[PDB]
């Protein structure tokens, strides 16, 4: 349910087909702690609110263009787009915090 981007073409298709519904982006990288700590908890608001919702991941290393792009500086990086508008956005793995974005937004 969480699709791991390949670059930044990749990332603008399944935006596309994504349509009208919440987007998450977790922009993250492999060394990153609070990244993995929260994973978990990612990949439950995501098979729980299929349907409505589409979590996208970003590995930092492997595209680091669309690091570039999206200006992240912090791991991890939530960006909640809807509709092509960035709705929200915020960094650190608070758990409570992201799923009261995606339930408000969904």
């Known amino acids: 349910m969480v699709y ?9 298709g399944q935006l596309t087909k994504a349509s009208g519904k919440l987007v998450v982006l977790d922009f993250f990288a492999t060394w990153c702690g609070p990244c993995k700590m929260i994973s978990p908890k990612l990949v439950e608001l995501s ?4 349907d409505n919702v589409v979590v996208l991941k970003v590995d930092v290393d492997e595209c680091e263009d669309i690091a570039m792009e999206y200006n992240i500086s ?17 960094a650190g793995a608070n758990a409570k915090r992201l799923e009261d974005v995606i339930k408000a937004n969904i």
């Open 4 to 12: 791991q981007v390949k670059d930044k073409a990749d990332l603008d």
């Open 47 to 50: 098979t729980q609110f299929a």
């Open 74 to 90: 912090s791991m991890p990086t939530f960006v909640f787009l809807k509709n092509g508008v960035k709705v929200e956005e915020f």
